[PDB]
Structure formats: C-alpha cells, structure tokens
Amino acid sequence: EAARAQPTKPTPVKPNYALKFTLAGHTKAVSSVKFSPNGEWLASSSADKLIKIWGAYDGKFEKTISGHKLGISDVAWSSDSNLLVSASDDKTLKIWDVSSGKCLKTLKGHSNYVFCCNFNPQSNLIVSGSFDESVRIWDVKTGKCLKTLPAHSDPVSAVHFNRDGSLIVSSSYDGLCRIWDTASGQCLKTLIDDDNPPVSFVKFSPNGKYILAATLDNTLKLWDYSKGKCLKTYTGHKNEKYCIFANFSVTGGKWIVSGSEDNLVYIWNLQTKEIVQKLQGHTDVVISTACHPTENIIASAALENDKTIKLWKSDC
Ligand SMILES: [Cl-]
C-alpha cells in the first residue's frame, strides 16, 4: 500500500495461459473470432448464420446479429470498433452497426462464397476473398466495389491490409501468397518456394515487415516479404484440411499463436520456434484464435462438435 514499504543468466519466458471462460450459444461450428480494436468486445461468426458479440474480459454474452441467408466464414472490426463486416456463403458481405445490430450495407459482386474479409486501418475500405478466386476492394461509405483483382486460380483463403493500408496480402489453395498495391491494384510480388503447398492463411506482422503464412502441410512460416525469404518455420500442430487463423501475440512475450486440427491452441516463441504452450479444452478443430490488443488474452473457437469460444489469460 506504499511503495517504500514493499520489498524489491537470463531464463527463457513461457506464458501461462489458463482457461477463464467458455462462451456457448452458437448452434453450429464457430468460424472466426476477433477482438474489437478498443479491447472491449469479441465478435464471433458461425455456420449458424449468426454473429455474436461478447464481453472481452468477462465473456458475457451481449447480443446476436442476424441477416445473412447462409453460414458465415469470417468477421472483422473497423478501426473505431463501431462497425463489423462479415463474409458469407450467401455470396455477400454485410456491414453492420455494432451498437444497433443493423445491416447498413450488403456488398454484392462475388459470384461464390465469400471466405475472408478485413477493413483497412483508415476503415474507408474493405478487402474480401472468395471461392470465385478473386479479391475485391470495397468502399465502406457507398458499398460499391472499387476493384476486382484476378488474384488466384483457386479459392482465396485470406486477405489482410498492412499497417498503413498501402498493401494487401492474399493467399490461396493455389499455393501462392500475393502482395497487391491497394491504390493501383497491381500485384507487386508473389511469394513462392519450391515446396509450394496450398496456402490456408496469411497476415502481415504488426510492424508490416513480415508476413505469417500457413500452409496445409502442417506448417506456419514467417516471411520477410521485402527480402523475399523465409525467416522462421513453426511446426508441431496439425493443419492439412482447414483455413485456421494464426496471430502475432505482442502484449507480453512475443509469440505466434494458432489453432490446430488436434483441437489444441499452439503457442510458439517467435524467435526460437519452440512450442511454449498447448492449450487443451476444445473438443473439435480449433479453427480460429485471436489475441487481445492490450491484455494477455487469447480467444479460441472450434468446429461442429464443440461450437464454443474460449477465453484464456496469461501473466506474460
Ligand atoms: Cl525471444
């Protein structure tokens, strides 16, 4: 209670994530969970055609958002935490007012399931990837498609803007990770290696220098996209069948976090590539993980035999 009255070789750090809450309510597989940028909320999407909003710190159910006619594969937040965008099998994205639950815009243009979506940092744009093999860039304000990029020759598994919105990275079962100029629509670089497995996920690092890429040979890799080379490889998990989300955990220790088809959340040391924790609790494939913006909190979500989201917290 008073600072003066309190008493004062490096050893590797490991996190100590422990289960705090299980969030149930979806009636089919959960597909994606994302924390709001302001840290207050978690949004989840599901095969049940619903989005649900939950308290990030207490896991308290807040609301259900509905309107899509078929199941939903992804959801993402605007930078101000006020909007969501969702990507559905109904071939549309919808933009939602989080406070009201209302659909503000339906984004029509894709000719097959919409698989992945994200706002840019400005949040004037949304990027989407589809089974129709295209990446589309949309105007948030008008709902109009601004550009259709003939990006891939198979479904687009992920799309992500870099920290200033100047680049988009896309991935596909076609084996490619492609980097696009947001303004011009031109492909600036294609990351390719000899092994060339299907690419199931991609995301820029927070500092924008690296790209984390998941491939369906049970591997995650960290690319330096400027240098066009692989810096790090993370293995030990199972990933041959699904587009599982992975993350840079930056609030405490510097980790890579992923789901896995063995029903665990995996956490690796980014530099050493050693697995530092495996989180056991889910009863089906962990399709999605997300890391809280400011606290050492992970959200995880699982497929049809589980249908729950779990919140885990660590001291580091
Ligand atoms: Cl380290």
From Swiss-Prot:
Outcome when changing residue 222 to K: Loss of interaction with RBBP5 and reduced ability to stimulate KMT2A methyltransferase activity in association with RBBP5 and ASH2L
Crosslink (Glycyl lysine isopeptide (Lys-Gly) (interchain with G-Cter in SUMO2)) position: 9, 28
Coiled-coil residues: none
Entry GO MF terms: histone binding; histone H3K4 methyltransferase activity; histone H3K4me1 reader activity; histone H3Q5ser reader activity
N6-acetyllysine PTM positions: 94
Result of changing residue 115 to A: Strongly reduced affinity for histone H3. Significant decrease in interaction with KMT2A
Record GO biological process: gluconeogenesis; negative regulation of transcription by RNA polymerase II; positive regulation of DNA-templated transcription; positive regulation of gluconeogenesis; regulation of cell cycle; regulation of cell division; regulation of DNA-templated transcription; regulation of embryonic development
Consequence the record notes for mutating residue 73 to F: Strongly reduced affinity for histone H3
Effect of residue 245 to A: Strongly reduced affinity for histone H3. Significant decrease in interaction with KMT2A
Pfam families according to UniProt: Beta-prop_WDR5
Outcome of substituting residue 190 to M: Found in a patient with childhood apraxia of speech; uncertain significance
Cell compartments where the protein resides: Nucleus
Outcome (variant: residue 89 to N): Strongly reduced affinity for histone H3
Cross-referenced InterPro entries: G-protein_beta_WD-40_rep, WD40/YVTN_repeat-like_dom_sf, WD40_repeat_CS, WD40_repeat_dom_sf, WD40_rpt
Keywords for the protein's UniProt record, in alphabetical order: Acetylation, Chromatin regulator, Host-virus interaction, Isopeptide bond, Nucleus, Repeat, Transcription, Transcription regulation, Ubl conjugation, WD repeat
WD repeats: 25-64, 67-108, 110-150, 151-190, 194-235, 238-278, 281-315
Major localisation: nucleus
GO cellular component: ATAC complex; histone acetyltransferase complex; histone methyltransferase complex; mitotic spindle; MLL1 complex; MLL1/2 complex; MLL3/4 complex; NSL complex
Family classification: Belongs to the WD repeat WDR5/wds family.
Function of the molecule: Contributes to histone modification. May position the N-terminus of histone H3 for efficient trimethylation at 'Lys-4'. As part of the MLL1/MLL complex it is involved in methylation and dimethylation at 'Lys-4' of histone H3. H3 'Lys-4' methylation represents a specific tag for epigenetic transcriptional activation. As part of the NSL complex it may be involved in acetylation of nucleosomal histone H4 on several lysine residues. May regulate osteoblasts differentiation.
Quaternary context: Interacts with PAXBP1; the interaction is direct and links a WDR5-containing histone methyltransferase complex to PAX7 and PAX3. Interacts with HCFC1. Component of the ATAC complex, a complex with histone acetyltransferase activity on histones H3 and H4. Component of the SET1 complex, at least composed of the catalytic subunit (SETD1A or SETD1B), WDR5, WDR82, RBBP5, ASH2L/ASH2, CXXC1/CFP1, HCFC1 and DPY30. Core component of several methyltransferase-containing complexes including MLL1/MLL, MLL2/3 (also named ASCOM complex) and MLL4/WBP7.
Name of the molecule in the record: WD repeat-containing protein 5
